[PDB]
Amino acid sequence: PKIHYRKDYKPSGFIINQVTLNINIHDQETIVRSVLDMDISKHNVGEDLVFDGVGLKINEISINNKKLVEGEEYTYDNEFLTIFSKFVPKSKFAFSSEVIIHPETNYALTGLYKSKNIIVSQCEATGFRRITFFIDRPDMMAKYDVTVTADKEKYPVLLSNGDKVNEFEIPGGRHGARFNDPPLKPCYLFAVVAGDLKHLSATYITKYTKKKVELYVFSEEKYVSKLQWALECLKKSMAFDEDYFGLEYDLSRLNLVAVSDFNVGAMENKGLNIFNANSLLASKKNSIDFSYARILTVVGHEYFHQYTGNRVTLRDWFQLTLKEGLTVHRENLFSEEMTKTVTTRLSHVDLLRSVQFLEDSSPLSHPIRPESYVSMENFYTTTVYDKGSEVMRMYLTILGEEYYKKGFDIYIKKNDGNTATCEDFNYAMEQAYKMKKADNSANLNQYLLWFSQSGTPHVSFKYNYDAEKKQYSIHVNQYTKPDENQKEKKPLFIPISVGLINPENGKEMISQTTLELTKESDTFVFNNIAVKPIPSLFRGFSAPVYIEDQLTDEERILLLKYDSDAFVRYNSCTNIYMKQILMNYNEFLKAKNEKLESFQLTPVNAQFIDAIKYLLEDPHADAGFKSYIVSLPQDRYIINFVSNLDTDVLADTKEYIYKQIGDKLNDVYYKMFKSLEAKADDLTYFNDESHVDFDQMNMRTLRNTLLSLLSKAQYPNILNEIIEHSKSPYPSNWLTSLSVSAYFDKYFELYDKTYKLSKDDELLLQEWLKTVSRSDRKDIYEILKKLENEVLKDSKNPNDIRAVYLPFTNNLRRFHDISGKGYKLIAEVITKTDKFNPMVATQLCEPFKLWNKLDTKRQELMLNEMNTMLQEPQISNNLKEYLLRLTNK
Numbered sequence: 001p002k003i004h005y006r007k008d009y010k011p012s013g014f015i016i017n018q019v020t021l022n023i024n025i026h027d028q029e030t031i032v033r034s035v036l037d038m039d040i041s042k043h044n045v046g047e048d049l050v051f052d053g054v055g056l057k058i059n060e061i062s063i064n065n066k067k068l069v070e071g072e073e074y075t076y077d078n079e080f081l082t083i084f085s086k087f088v089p090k091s092k093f094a095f096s097s098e099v100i101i102h103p104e105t106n107y108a109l110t111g112l113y114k115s116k117n118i119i120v121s122q123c124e125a126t127g128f129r130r131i132t133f134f135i136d137r138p139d140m141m142a143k144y145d146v147t148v149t150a151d152k153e154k155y156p157v158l159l160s161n162g163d164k165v166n167e168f169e170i171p172g173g174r175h176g177a178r179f180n181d182p183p184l185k186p187c188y189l190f191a192v193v194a195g196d197l198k199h200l201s202a203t204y205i206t207k208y209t210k211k212k213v214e215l216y217v218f219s220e221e222k223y224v225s226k227l228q229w230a231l232e233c234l235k236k237s238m239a240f241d242e243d244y245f246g247l248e249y250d251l252s253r254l255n256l257v258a259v260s261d262f263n264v265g266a267m268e269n270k271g272l273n274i275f276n277a278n279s280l281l282a283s284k285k286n287s288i289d290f291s292y293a294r295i296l297t298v299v300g301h302e303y304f305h306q307y308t309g310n311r312v313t314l315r316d317w318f319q320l321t322l323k324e325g326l327t328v329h330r331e332n333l334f335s336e337e338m339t340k341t342v343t344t345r346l347s348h349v350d351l352l353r354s355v356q357f358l359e360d361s362s363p364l365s366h367p368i369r370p371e372s373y374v375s376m377e378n379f380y381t382t383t384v385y386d387k388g389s390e391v392m393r394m395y396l397t398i399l400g401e402e403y404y405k406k407g408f409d410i411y412i413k414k415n416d417g418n419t420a421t422c423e424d425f426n427y428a429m430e431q432a433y434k435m436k437k438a439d440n441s442a443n444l445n446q447y448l449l450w451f452s453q454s455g456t457p458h459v460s461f462k463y464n465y466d467a468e469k470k471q472y473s474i475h476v477n478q479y480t481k482p483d484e485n486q487k488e489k490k491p492l493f494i495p496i497s498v499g500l501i502n503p504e505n506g507k508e509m510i511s512q513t514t515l516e517l518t519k520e521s522d523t524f525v526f527n528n529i530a531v532k533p534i535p536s537l538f539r540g541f542s543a544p545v546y547i548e549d550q551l552t553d554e555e556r557i558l559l560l561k562y563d564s565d566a567f568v569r570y571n572s573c574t575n576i577y578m579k580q581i582l583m584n585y586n587e588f589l590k591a592k593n594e595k596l597e598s599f600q601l602t603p604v605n606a607q608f609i610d611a612i613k614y615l616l617e618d619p620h621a622d623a624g625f626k627s628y629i630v631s632l633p634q635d636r637y638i639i640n641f642v643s644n645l646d647t648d649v650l651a652d653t654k655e656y657i658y659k660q661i662g663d664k665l666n667d668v669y670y671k672m673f674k675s676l677e678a679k680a681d682d683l684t685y686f687n688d689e690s691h692v693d694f695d696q697m698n699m700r701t702l703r704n705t706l707l708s709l710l711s712k713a714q715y716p717n718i719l720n721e722i723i724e725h726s727k728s729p730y731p732s733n734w735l736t737s738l739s740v741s742a743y744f745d746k747y748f749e750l751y752d753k754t755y756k757l758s759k760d761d762e763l764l765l766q767e768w769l770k771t772v773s774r775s776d777r778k779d780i781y782e783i784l785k786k787l788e789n790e791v792l793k794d795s796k797n798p799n800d801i802r803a804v805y806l807p808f809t810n811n812l813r814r815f816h817d818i819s820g821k822g823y824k825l826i827a828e829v830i831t832k833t834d835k836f837n838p839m840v841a842t843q844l845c846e847p848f849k850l851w852n853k854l855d856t857k858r859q860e861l862m863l864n865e866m867n868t869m870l871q872e873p874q875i876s877n878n879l880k881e882y883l884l885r886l887t888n889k
Ligand SMILES: CC(C)(C)OC(=O)N[C@H](C(=O)NO)c1ccc(-c2cccc(/C(N)=N/O)c2)cc1
Pocket: 108, 109, 110, 111, 122, 123, 124, 125, 126, 127, 262, 263, 264, 265, 266, 267, 268, 297, 298, 301, 302, 305, 324, 328, 376, 377, 380, 385, 839
């Protein structure tokens, strides 16, 4: 297993100036002819000419139109094509080859493959080598001339990068299309699409140069009615980059294409963005509410790549976070601006502190710029993406909006058209930092540690207030636990957005302030503070850290009710919950360990419950925010704070706490559920696909959250509501009716009803599968078997497989069954999947990421299944490398 180190980057000894492709698609095979106009670089030392090439069937390879002979002129081991230096020209030459590939049987969805009746490519990161020979790395920039030929009635629409410069008929019912793309690009941005595609279209006129841009969104004919929202999102995306960053699109046309089989959400191929259907297609009748935020995010994300990734590209894959962290950040700014709801920011903090914090304390922990990799197909992590985005966001927090826009523009203008590294971005940010602090001595050298240091920092606080002096002090400390990446952790540049709240009237006591913590510890002093304040710390979650506020629950309740920052309120509620959870947890744990016949539990803080009621009953309070405060922290967030977690005890803890709050607030819950119905389920714009109300969807979220709480509590005659709910036109509602009916005998009745509603829409059925998978059923294992036999079968669609199993793995009490049958089940699915799609197989490994955090019994159970998987003879390099690192081998 070859290990690539970041320190070992060297430019190639070769140059590829021009690529000329002929891709001829037939039913049983695809013939790929390629001419590479190449040259010798200044770093050449007379080495062999080595091309990447995986799974290629060689018909003929040549140098300068002279046929090459296999044996003494070249060798091919199905991974590398080696041409011995003796036969490699000393100056400009042409390499050519013809290979046969097989998209119809390519189930790994990398390279060229067939998704239902659409031929589609996916080349990032190392997929182009599966199509033809190439030096498959992002710093090999080349021009592209691409011709695609196929059967006309099966594949009337042909697409590739650049301008379509020719269309022509071919004897035998075939046709061809030529695409020339003069600007240089890395090969991972190459794309080709063929199929019977239908489209929606629009023309966008850019803000400053008034350039006309054609916008096309494609899908199969059956789902062409689900394309409208996507087109709107694209328009919104183009406008935002124009308005915020002053950046326009530079090409004449942009195509968006949905396919049913895709490993991730989407891909940013130049002028030809390719989407997982679930991240591009939606209609109000056939999609749940989450689809609309999802499409906005993903469409936006791939668009923003056009600058941060496509025009300014990567030198090497170790710089991945430079285009991904930055593009996610750009997407967050976009989505927060589009939704105008505080839950947008809250949701991505919620995801970070759950999933990413878990990864960062796991054996898989890595910095956002790793020092090494084996399998590139394991490189695209929540750390690189989501922690990366938070690191990119901190630049904005530190600099402020004005100087950030300055710094960002410096980055774009200086690096446009060439490759870049993380240092290039920090440099640009540093220039703005100098201008902001008004001295060229200031620097951001320490900030670079955010790129190299792994692990989540802990930030803790202590306070002093001198009433006579009117002087307030915040003593801050930071620490990162040592791991396998750094034995010794260094202090980071941590920006702490703070406010001081007067507890007597809830007013701000100081102006907007961002504390710059650059040492292991510091003391921040504030003068003329009239009264002892309650500190509002890390507003907007200004740094990706563990926040230890050391506040009393009384202080937290006061912030929850009266603070101005949405995150700090949400975090205060979170912190109150966590304290309660930890307390009830080893009360239950002690009772179990000591086998007590009787024991006591500490009740939920009564004033806390009162504060929740206060906020819920406030008509001006945000519905989305409301849904968060009545929900306990994610299981994967809680696990970060408990050693040897007994999942049964945690389940009992959550049950007690939910019941405690329910016993006091169920009447309030029911009252709100009924009073919210009118506005939440308003059908006024149900048939307007371009009208999306994120506030209204948040109202539905609240109703479905409340209904779930009421159903679990067996609230009087709540089954009546559930039945009525199932008749709602909104899928979010009638799918909710299915899941909440799990606590009643009408479950399988709604099972059949909702299935009949879902079965004729590919994406809707997958949402139905998710709903069933996450149903709180005691017979969930029997139900899964039913899904496998009657619906899933031997589908290789990643959307189907993920829908059936992933939500189930979040069933705390059932997936972590002490028999280990849950671990056994998913491991079977992983091994089965690994035989045709190694990438999705590692995705299915996610439940195991916390294995060393559980109780000793469940640790062993999980470790056994992982070792069983590791011992599969046909295990992929992909899965093997992942499980080896996860199990510390
Ligand atoms: C949700 C979000 C937009 C953040 O991520 C994606 O939907 N896709 C990411 C991305 O950065 N898009 O711009 C993504 C992640 C991994 C990959 C990827 C990496 C390595 C291999 C493959 C591949 N060949 N899949 O079949 C795919 C492609 C896109």
